[PDB]
Amino acid sequence: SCIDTCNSVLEVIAYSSSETPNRHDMLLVEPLNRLLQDKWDRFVKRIFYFNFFVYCLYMIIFTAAAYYRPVEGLPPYKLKNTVGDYFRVTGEILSVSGGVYFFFRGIQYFLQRRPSLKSLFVDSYSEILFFVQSLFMLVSVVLYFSQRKEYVASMVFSLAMGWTNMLYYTRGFQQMGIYAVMIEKMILRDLCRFMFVYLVFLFGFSTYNSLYSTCLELFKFTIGMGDLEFTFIILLLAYVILTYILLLNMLIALMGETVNKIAQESKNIWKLQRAITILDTEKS
Amino acid sequence: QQMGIYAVMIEKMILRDLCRFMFVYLVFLFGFSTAVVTLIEDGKYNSLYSTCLELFKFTIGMGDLEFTENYDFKAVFIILLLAYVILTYILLLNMLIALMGETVNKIAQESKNIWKLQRAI
Ligand code: NA
């Protein structure tokens, strides 16, 4: 009573404000975990798999349509009486339809949920990312019909975001879903700290008579491609010792520490994500 | 005993960590390669295979960051390459090392028992 559906307990815990002390732990309570697993294995596994298949088809069609884009200049491009041109245009139409679908789904989520502008950009990262991909697609359409070739820039950012968003569907499989929660926690905590310090050091040591060229040359060192003679020796050696040999290995060590302490927290967050998916599937 | 346990650990790492890592890494690589090759107008790297190989070179410490110039919007190309590098090389490959360390920490007894069962067989 008032657990399955009512303010129901599951809808209270799942849609919490992200300040609740134990939002991730309240789902480990005896009857709730077994109820969510029952709902999953009964109907939400199949629905979620169908959604994943539909998204994979959408991304495949979008990739195919963008791959075979014409190179003539100043769109729109007139369609030729060729089967290939009829496949390309239908793929483009499907891509634009999916973008509109995701834009409207993001608007509906921001309306019915009313995030408080902090949990907006501190929780619900999936919704924002899909919405941002849809925004890129719509901006691409607008630029395309304005006779601007910058439509391709917006389209390729929509494609890389859409392919990186496939990591959303790792939830629904425990091992991959927890690995993806651990990727989120690495990005928010270790990559952020390392990137701040690393960027400060890089900009200082970079400050080839242009700032951009020298910054790129010094960044090549981070990826194992540094020249040491690209165009001084003490500065380059100091930069190498402080970034490559110290800061990048320290990042590995801190990543090892994080993984050791987030094991239980990563599983709870994945379970909460799947509970949110199960509630969304039930409501819609 | 020592080489036996080492091989068992290799088996466990191939089945768990390499698998999870390869799935996420291949998804990222294909997405970023489809974006880069779409941005490219023409030339030597206007094929999916060529761009995929160029972006995979980054994983092995041989990435160019300037392997082509047949495009418009150089900013778009640089941003895509930097995003791919930050997401794979600096994050995912180090996370793999960190997850491999955890696995080593947690599979000593399991790896010795499996080796003993192998020798019994
Ligand atoms: Na190298």
Author numbering:
A (entry chain A): 385 to 390, 393 to 593, 627 to 650, 659 to 711
B (entry chain D): 560 to 603, 627 to 703
Task: Show sentences the authors wrote.
The capsaicin- and heat-activated receptor, TRPV1, has served as a model for deciphering lipid modulation, which is relevant to understanding how pro-algesic agents enhance channel activity in the setting of inflammatory pain. Identification of a pocket within the TRPV1 transmembrane core has provided initial clues as to how phosphoinositide lipids bind to and regulate the channel. Here we show that this regulatory pocket in rat TRPV1 can accommodate diverse lipid species, including the inflammatory lipid lysophosphatidic acid, whose actions are determined by their specific modes of binding. We captured several states of TRPV1 ranging from channels in which the VBP is empty to those bearing different bioactive lipids, including distinct phosphoinositide species, brominated phosphoinositide analogs and a pro-algesic lipid, lysophosphatidic acid (LPA). Together, our data show how the VBP accommodates a range of bioactive lipids and how occupancy of the site corresponds to the structural status of the pore.
To resolve this question, we exploited our ability to generate TRPV1 protein with an empty vanilloid pocket, into which we introduced tetrabrominated analogs of PI or PIP2 (PI–Br4 and PIP2–Br4, respectively) as contrast-enhancing probes to distinguish these lipids from the other, unbrominated lipids in the nanodiscs. Previous work has established that brominated lipids are faithful analogs of the unsaturated lipids from which they are synthesized. The well-resolved inositol headgroup of the bound lipids showed the expected differential location of phosphate moieties, most notably at the 4 and 5 positions for PIP2. Together, these data demonstrate that the vanilloid site can accommodate PI or PIP2, where they act as negative regulatory factors to stabilize the closed state.
